[PDB]
Design a protein around this nucleic acid. Structure first.
Length: 231
RNA sequence: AUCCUUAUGCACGGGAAAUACGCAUAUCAGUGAGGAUUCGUCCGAGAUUGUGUUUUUGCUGGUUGAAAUUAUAAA
């Protein structure tokens, strides 16, 4: 309640089961959300699980909007804007992500060049990038908020277990944190695209119910050793 | 109040069939449709036309393949 921009929480709640349909459904939902947003002049972030996912998502987005309307994302006349784009498009953008950037729905992830990543970060800040597909780096690191924040999916793979776990509350909260800009905009759009069964669990997490539970059992021994060494 | 008959409506349940099942600004039709016949008579409700699907509508599930793919980060 004491937050600068109040966070409008939202869940999709996917009913589908099989992964080929489910994914499609999720994509559709995302598109719908994006459509709802961009018409209001809303700059938007789409979190995903993995690095490889992001680019594909971006590609999908590109193929969907061009059928209906290319114009709403590049609306400006672009005499100076175009020039700017030219300047900051084909410098060192290697990963075949340059096309995405050109389109105007780019991405930032661990596995994009330090220069490239920086550019991506600033291509929002300067005031041009509409949509931003993202891994969970941005939430952890960078302060840059972006009105609409969609979290695509539940199942992250952790090598800790060696299994597809649900999105952990501590990360989800962090992700949600970046939203409507405290300085400029009034409020924030927070969306979770998810499986319907795990929403019941997620709702509680969203209300900040699950506390700080200690994980000192793994890191105890080393600490103890260090202490001993210290004398 | 108890038991039954008929029709219907809603359903459990069990079957068969979809070569069937509709629809119509149509034409006609118990003031006769279409049929029987031992030829005396008898049954009595659709027919014509047009047309929409019709080896099938709607949904689910699996195996598969398809190639099915794993977050960040400090020392």
């Amino acid at each position: 309640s004491f937050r600068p921009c109040p966070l409008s929480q939202q869940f999709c709640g996917i009913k589908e089961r099989n992964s080929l349909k489910k994914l499609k459904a999720m994509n559709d939902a995302c598109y719908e959300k994006v459509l709802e947003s961009i018409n209001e002049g809303n700059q938007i972030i789409v979190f995903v699980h993995s690095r490889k996912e992001t680019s594909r998502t971006a590609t999908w987005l590109k193929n969907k909007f061009a059928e209906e309307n290319i114009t709403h994302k590049l609306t400006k006349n672009d005499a100076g804007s175009k020039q700017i784009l030219k300047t900051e498009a084909a410098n060192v953008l290697d990963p075949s992500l340059r096309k995405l950037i050109e389109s105007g729905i780019g991405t930032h992830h661990a596995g994009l060049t330090r220069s490239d990543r920086s550019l991506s970060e600033d291509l929002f800040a300067d005031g041009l990038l509409q949509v931003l597909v993202c891994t969970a780096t941005l939430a952890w690191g960078v302060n840059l908020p972006a009105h609409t924040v969609i979290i695509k999916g539940t199942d992250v793979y952790s090598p800790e277990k060696g299994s597809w776990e649900q999105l952990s509350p501590q990360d989800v909260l962090q992700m949600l944190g970046r939203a409507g800009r405290p300085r400029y905009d009034t409020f924030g759009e927070g969306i979770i695209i998810t499986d319907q069964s795990n929403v019941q669990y997620y709702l509680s997490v969203l209300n900040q119910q699950l506390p700080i539970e200690s994980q000192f059992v793994s890191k105890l021994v080393d600490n103890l050793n260090a202490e001993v060494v210290a004398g």
